[PDB]
């Protein structure tokens, strides 16, 4: 199922959905995989998250050209850390319109990231303000509250059983919540559960650092986060 393409890995999840995976050495710790998504919506392609680097992100675009061969209409990135925004310049060089949580764009410079071109804003209940996410097709963007970071956002794919938790969600057998350096430990559990409640039909949960899992990823992540309080 997995397709090795250079130093990246691509896995089809649904007729119109693929997971992209890229790797970065975290010195002394290891080569960390990070996942995002590629969605075909009719005659265009939508991307969720960059790879870690510009070069890797250009390779995602090369894979899209070879395997889908339709324009990439936009990309949305799910918080201001390198695994999700490190390739912003490659998207801009390719002429792709880019979107992030307003807070992600504000944080980008201090995090060493390049901001996206457009800012998403969110209603009090967490759903994106639709005028800020034009032409998102089946992508349904939800801010679940602070968790892995204060700016973390999540994405459901309408018409599929897939929802993407990014770095908020860990798999159903994960031993830890990963990098909590920028986390909101008090609100993490509620934010994880809010993600699950926003996408009740999603039976396939996609996340940054593990293979797609069942909804037990959500319950297990929230149960682990209960202990942080
Ligand atoms: O494996 C990692 C992955 C990340 C990126 P993320 O948190 O978005 O997964 C990371 C980071 F951003 C800061 C850090 F200090 C250690 C880290 O270690
Ligand atoms: Zn992160
Ligand atoms: Zn992460």
Swiss-Prot record:
Primary location recorded for the protein, binned into one broad class = periplasm
- Please write the reaction equations for the catalytic activity of this protein: a beta-lactam + H2O = a substituted beta-amino acid
Q: Any idea which positions bind substrate?
A: 170, 179
Record-level Gene Ontology MF annotations: beta-lactamase activity; zinc ion binding
Positions of transmembrane segments: none
What does its activity-regulation comment describe?
Inhibits by captopril, thiorphan, dimercaprol and tiopronin. This enzyme is not susceptible to inactivation by the beta-lactamase-blocking agents clavulanic acid.
Q: Where in the cell is it found?
A: Periplasm
The note describing how and how many cofactors are bound reads:
Binds 2 Zn(2+) ions per subunit.
- Supply one GO CC term from the record: periplasmic space
Enzyme class, broadest EC rank: hydrolase
Q: Which UniProt keyword terms apply here?
A: Antibiotic resistance, Hydrolase, Metal-binding, Periplasm, Plasmid, Signal, Zinc
Q: Which residues bind Zn(2+) 2?
A: 83, 167, 209
Identify which cofactors the protein needs according to its UniProt entry.
Zn(2+)
One example of a Gene Ontology biological process annotation: response to antibiotic
Which residues bind Zn(2+) 1 per the record? 79, 81, 148
Q: Please state the Enzyme Commission number of this protein.
A: 3.5.2.6
Assembly, per entry: Monomer.
Primary role: Confers resistance to the different beta-lactams antibiotics (penicillin, cephalosporin and carbapenem) via the hydrolysis of the beta-lactam ring. Does not confer resistance to the polymixin colistin or the fluoroquinolone ciprofloxacin.
Family note? Belongs to the metallo-beta-lactamase superfamily. Class-B beta-lactamase family.
State the remark under miscellaneous: Enterobacteriaceae carrying this gene (identified by PCR) have been isolated in Sweden, India, Pakistan, Bangladesh, England, Scotland, Northern Ireland, Australia and the USA. The organisms they were identified in were K.pneumoniae, Enterobacter cloacae, E.coli, Proteus spp, Citrobacter freundii, Morganella morganii, Providencia spp and Klebsille oxytoca. In India most isolates were from community-acquired infections rather than hospital-acquired infections, indicating the gene is widespread in the environment.
What is this protein's name?
Answer: Metallo-beta-lactamase type 2
Give the source lineage, highest ranks first.
Bacteria, Pseudomonadati, Pseudomonadota, Gammaproteobacteria, Enterobacterales
């Amino acid at each position: 199922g997995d397709q090795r393409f250079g130093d990246l890995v691509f896995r089809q999840l649904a007729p119109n959905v693929w997971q992209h995976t890229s790797y970065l050495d975290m010195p002394g710790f290891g080569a960390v995989a990070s996942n995002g998504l590629i969605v075909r919506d009719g005659g265009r392609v939508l991307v969720v998250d960059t790879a870690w680097t510009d070069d890797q992100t250009a390779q995602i675009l090369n894979w899209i050209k070879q395997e889908i061969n339709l324009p990439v209409a936009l990309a949305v990135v799910t918080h201001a850390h390198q695994d999700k925004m490190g390739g912003m310049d490659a998207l801009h060089a390719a002429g792709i319109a880019t979107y992030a949580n307003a807070l992600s764009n504000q944080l980008a410079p201090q995090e060493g990231m390049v901001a996206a071109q457009h800012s998403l804003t969110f209603a009090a209940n967490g759903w994106v303000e639709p005028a800020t996410a034009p032409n998102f097709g089946p992508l349904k963007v939800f801010y679940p509250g602070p968790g892995h970071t204060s700016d973390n956002i999540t994405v459901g794919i309408d018409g599929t059983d897939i929802a993407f938790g990014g770095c908020l969600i860990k798999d159903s057998k994960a031993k830890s919540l990963g990098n909590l350096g920028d986390a909101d430990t008090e609100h993490y559990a509620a934010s994880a559960r809010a993600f699950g409640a926003a996408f009740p039909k999603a039976s396939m949960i996609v996340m940054s650092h593990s293979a797609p899992d069942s909804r037990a990823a959500i319950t297990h992540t929230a149960r682990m986060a209960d202990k942080l309080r």
